[PDB]
Structure formats: structure tokens, C-alpha cells
Amino acid sequence: GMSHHWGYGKHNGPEHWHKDFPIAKGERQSPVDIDTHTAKYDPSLKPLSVSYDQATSLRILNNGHAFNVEFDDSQDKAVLKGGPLDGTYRLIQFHFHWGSLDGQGSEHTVDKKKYAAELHLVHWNTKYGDFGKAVQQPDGLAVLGIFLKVGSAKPGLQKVVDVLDSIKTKGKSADFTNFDPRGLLPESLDYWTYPGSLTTPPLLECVTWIVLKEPISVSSEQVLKFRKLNFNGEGEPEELMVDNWRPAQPLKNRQIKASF
Ligand SMILES: NS(=O)(=O)c1ccc(C(=O)N2CCC(O)(c3ccccc3)CC2)cc1
Ligand SMILES: [Zn+2]
């Protein structure tokens, strides 16, 4: 992807992506608006299992689109299973999408409501051996999405907030060990699930989306720090990393299932 030029600006944003990635207008694109009244309870959905006790974080990277907290996924240490999933999915990284204002920022919406941000915990199906092979499969990834609203601070998020100063610009990375992703989860694991895609180019249709109903609360100071990051690289004109979210896409021939 050394020649990719997509972004979130007026000239390379979501409405332009289809030119280089035609799948942008595909049959199972994400995100989507979750109409809570139309989603149907599916009593066959097995309980969701989030096993992050042995998670091993390694580094945090500003990739020019968001920042990723990466994990060691060379072993089954932090896995997601159950719910609508068949098999074991290993945590590889998490990142967020956020806005320039508290009134926008999330990718998925709930009855058209936009949250201040959205956390994506990305996992890949171990039956495919590695992440690169998994994204070529319809059931290759499972992304656990969690909404963020502004209110009380999330103590478990502070370690991330404080390290952002070291990765202000595109390409910067910093050691980020011993971070516990369990501190970013809400109390309830009630969720909505549907078949979708990566929300950024290449927009591959390889994701089983599991979006939690309960948002976590973060403080204004915490999200404000996210907005101080840069899309640009060091020594380049400063462009604040804000509004790095793709808007809701057509649901088309899909049904959103609720676990509750
Ligand atoms: N917001 S999202 O849908 O949760 C998401 C998750 C991961 C990525 C990601 O890491 N990308 C996309 C896939 C990627 O382009 C790729 C493609 C093919 C092989 C290996 C990696 C690598 C970069 C992008 C978006
Ligand atoms: Zn994402």
C-alpha cells in the first residue's frame, strides 16, 4: 500500500474511496446504522467469550489514519470466541475512530445516534494461520466495537492517553507493554452482530461485527488528547487527526441480530 492516497479529507475521504477500492459499494460494507427496533433477538447466539487475561501488548503506532495498540498474536493469549463466532479469534490490535466534536466520531450509529468515538478490538480467525490470509476470507476477522461517550473518565484508558505525546505524527511508534485491554470494556457484553467489512480501505468483506450495546464513558480531557494527534508526518503541515470515521453504509441484504 505504498501508493495508497486515501484519507479522511475533502479530496480523499470516504466518498472517494470507491475509485481505488470498488468494493466500497459492495453488498456487505461497514459501518452501518443499527436500528434497534428492527434488530432481532437471536436466542441461538451462544454467550460471548472475551479472554484477555494473558494479553501481551507490545507497541503503539500512529499509522496516519488512527493509532494502533498492537499485541503479540503469535500464540493464543487474548482470544474472542462464542457469540456468533465459530472457532477462535486472536486479538492483534485495537484502535479508535473519533470526531472533531463530542457529537460525532463513531462509525456505527444506533438509531442514527453518533457517539464521540468507537473502539475497535480486531481479532483474526486462527483457522487461517495469520492476519493477512484471514482478511481474504468471509469469516476471517471478528471486530468487537465499543462506543465511547463523554462523561466520567475511563481509568483504564489513561495509559493510552498519556503515551500519545510520543506518537504525535504518522509513522511514530512507542513501546507499549503490559497494557490490559480488559480496562476498556463496559460492564455488560450484550451486543448486536452482523456480517460486514473493514471500515477503511481496502474495505475487504471479511468481518463479523460484534458491537456492544453499552458504551464506556471517557472524559472530555481524554478525548481531547486524541484530537491533538496528527494525520501528517513530522515536519509536515499540521493536520489534526480528527473525524477519522467512515459514515454508515447501506444495510442491503443483511439482518442485524441482537444477543439480548
Ligand atoms: N476499522 S476496522 O475495520 O476495524 C480495520 C481493522 C484493521 C485494519 C488494518 O489493519 N488494515 C486493513 C487490512 C490491511 O490493509 C491488510 C490487507 C491485506 C493483507 C494484510 C493487511 C492492513 C491494514 C483496517 C481497518
Ligand atoms: Zn476501526
Side-chain angles (χ1 to χ4, degrees):
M2 290 179 68
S3 291
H4 283 186
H5 76 141
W6 66 270
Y8 293 95
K10 192 163 190 174
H11 298 96
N12 66 358
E15 302 312 311
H16 288 274
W17 300 349
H18 73 100
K19 289 174 278 172
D20 283 295
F21 306 94
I23 198 62
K25 294 176 180 295
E27 301 304 306
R28 52 176 285 186
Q29 288 290 291
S30 296
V32 301
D33 173 57
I34 297 166
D35 189 86
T36 68
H37 289 295
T38 300
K40 192 189 175 185
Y41 169 59
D42 184 345
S44 72
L45 285 169
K46 298 178 175 183
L48 191 61
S49 172
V50 182
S51 301
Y52 293 167
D53 47 289
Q54 297 291 295
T56 303
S57 66
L58 299 172
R59 191 182 67 145
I60 185 170
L61 166 76
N62 176 329
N63 62 24
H65 304 294
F67 64 82
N68 295 344
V69 169
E70 305 160 348
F71 291 77
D72 166 25
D73 64 344
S74 66
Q75 271 191 280
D76 270 3
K77 286 178 180 179
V79 303
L80 179 66
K81 59 175 47 49
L85 312 168
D86 286 327
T88 299
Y89 289 70
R90 199 176 293 172
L91 176 66
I92 175 173
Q93 58 108 321
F94 73 72
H95 59 273
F96 304 79
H97 299 266
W98 61 93
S100 51
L101 305 167
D102 299 345
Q104 62 195 55
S106 66
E107 299 207 297
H108 289 87
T109 53
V110 181
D111 292 331
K112 297 300 176 87
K113 172 191 174 73
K114 287 176 176 83
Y115 283 88
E118 185 175 328
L119 165 63
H120 288 163
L121 288 133
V122 185
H123 313 74
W124 53 274
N125 197 327
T126 63
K127 74 191 297 184
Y128 300 123
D130 67 58
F131 182 83
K133 173 64 179 310
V135 300
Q136 305 180 196
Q137 315 307 318
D139 59 348
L141 302 190
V143 185
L144 177 61
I146 301 177
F147 295 117
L148 276 63
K149 63 183 188 179
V150 173
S152 299
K154 188 66 167 175
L157 178 62
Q158 198 56 38
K159 271 290 193 173
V160 173
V161 168
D162 291 324
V163 79
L164 299 183
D165 288 49
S166 65
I167 58 158
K168 184 188 184 74
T169 48
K170 179 175 169 51
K172 289 291 188 175
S173 68
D175 297 312
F176 200 62
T177 57
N178 302 287
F179 178 76
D180 192 344
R182 292 176 294 188
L184 300 175
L185 307 175
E187 170 186 324
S188 178
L189 293 183
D190 285 344
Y191 65 85
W192 290 288
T193 183
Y194 76 96
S197 71
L198 296 176
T199 66
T200 71
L203 302 170
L204 301 170
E205 296 181 327
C206 61
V207 182
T208 291
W209 277 95
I210 298 176
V211 179
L212 300 191
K213 176 193 61 176
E214 188 192 317
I216 54 166
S217 291
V218 300
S219 69
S220 56
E221 292 78 17
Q222 289 180 316
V223 68
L224 275 166
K225 177 71 88 71
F226 280 24
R227 303 182 186 132
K228 287 184 181 183
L229 288 166
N230 283 188
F231 281 128
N232 57 284
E234 176 179 21
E236 279 169 35
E238 177 168 41
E239 243 314 74
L240 297 184
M241 182 179 281
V242 296
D243 295 316
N244 57 349
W245 50 279
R246 183 191 196 192
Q249 301 301 303
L251 187 62
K252 296 186 177 182
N253 190 46
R254 293 176 289 178
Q255 295 187 311
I256 296 178
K257 298 175 185 177
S259 75
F260 55 99

XYZ file of all heavy atoms in Angstrom, residues 54 64 68 77 118 135 150 153 164 169 174 178 187 189 245 256 260:
136
model
N -4.301 -13.192 29.446
C -2.900 -13.356 29.062
C -2.463 -12.443 27.916
O -1.425 -12.677 27.287
C -2.645 -14.812 28.682
C -2.861 -15.783 29.827
C -1.804 -15.636 30.899
O -0.623 -15.893 30.658
N -2.217 -15.212 32.087
N -1.061 7.182 10.630
C -1.515 8.221 9.726
C -3.020 8.268 9.538
O -3.533 9.195 8.912
N -2.719 2.442 16.548
C -2.966 1.054 16.899
C -2.144 0.596 18.086
O -0.935 0.826 18.136
C -2.598 0.110 15.746
C -3.467 0.299 14.526
O -4.529 0.905 14.603
N -3.022 -0.233 13.390
N -3.223 -16.010 23.238
C -3.088 -15.337 24.533
C -4.278 -14.466 24.911
O -4.633 -14.337 26.086
C -1.849 -14.454 24.533
C -0.524 -15.189 24.636
C 0.614 -14.182 24.569
C 1.980 -14.842 24.675
N 3.048 -13.814 24.575
N -15.386 5.419 18.777
C -15.679 3.999 18.739
C -14.360 3.240 18.764
O -13.427 3.529 17.998
C -16.487 3.639 17.475
C -16.943 2.179 17.399
C -17.828 1.933 16.185
O -18.550 2.867 15.797
O -17.805 0.812 15.642
N -7.866 -11.913 6.235
C -8.661 -10.851 5.603
C -9.158 -11.204 4.205
O -9.959 -10.471 3.639
C -7.926 -9.475 5.535
C -7.592 -9.004 6.940
C -6.677 -9.566 4.676
N -18.807 10.886 26.181
C -18.043 11.774 27.050
C -18.767 12.019 28.374
O -19.932 12.425 28.398
C -17.771 13.113 26.339
C -17.135 14.111 27.309
C -16.836 12.873 25.156
N -14.231 9.911 33.407
C -13.046 9.346 32.774
C -13.032 7.821 32.879
O -13.634 7.243 33.785
C -11.783 9.913 33.424
N 0.298 9.155 23.970
C 0.063 9.781 22.669
C 1.034 10.904 22.319
O 1.302 11.139 21.137
C -1.380 10.282 22.557
C -2.476 9.217 22.672
C -3.824 9.871 22.473
C -2.263 8.126 21.625
N 2.840 12.115 15.289
C 2.778 12.098 13.836
C 2.873 10.725 13.172
O 3.340 9.754 13.767
C 3.891 13.000 13.275
O 5.127 12.672 13.925
C 3.560 14.490 13.526
N 5.903 3.675 19.711
C 6.489 3.662 21.045
C 6.215 2.323 21.725
O 5.178 1.690 21.496
C 5.907 4.797 21.879
N 2.512 -4.367 28.637
C 1.706 -4.601 29.814
C 0.425 -3.794 29.913
O -0.041 -3.491 31.008
C 2.584 -4.410 31.054
C 3.803 -5.348 31.048
O 3.676 -6.552 31.261
N 4.977 -4.792 30.777
N -19.454 -2.910 31.465
C -19.919 -3.956 32.361
C -20.618 -5.103 31.620
O -20.320 -6.284 31.830
C -20.879 -3.312 33.360
C -21.666 -4.246 34.233
C -22.686 -3.489 35.073
O -22.360 -2.357 35.499
O -23.794 -4.032 35.310
N -21.879 -7.389 28.296
C -21.402 -7.863 26.996
C -22.570 -8.055 26.005
O -22.425 -8.759 25.000
C -20.601 -9.166 27.152
C -19.269 -9.018 27.895
C -18.532 -10.360 27.935
C -18.402 -7.945 27.196
N -13.544 8.719 10.760
C -14.608 7.726 10.732
C -15.287 7.692 9.373
O -15.390 8.709 8.683
C -15.673 8.025 11.816
C -16.192 9.459 11.846
C -15.581 10.533 12.422
C -17.418 9.958 11.271
N -16.342 11.672 12.244
C -17.470 11.345 11.539
C -18.471 9.368 10.555
C -18.535 12.158 11.117
C -19.532 10.181 10.137
C -19.548 11.560 10.423
N -29.466 -7.526 11.257
C -28.665 -7.338 12.452
C -29.351 -8.155 13.544
O -30.579 -8.070 13.736
C -28.601 -5.853 12.852
C -27.877 -5.072 11.749
C -27.846 -5.685 14.187
C -27.793 -3.581 11.996
N -29.615 -9.986 23.056
C -30.496 -9.741 24.193
C -31.933 -9.468 23.752
O -32.094 -8.849 22.674
C -29.956 -8.545 24.990
C -29.775 -7.296 24.158
C -30.735 -6.293 24.183
C -28.669 -7.147 23.314
C -30.610 -5.162 23.383
C -28.531 -6.019 22.510
C -29.502 -5.023 22.541
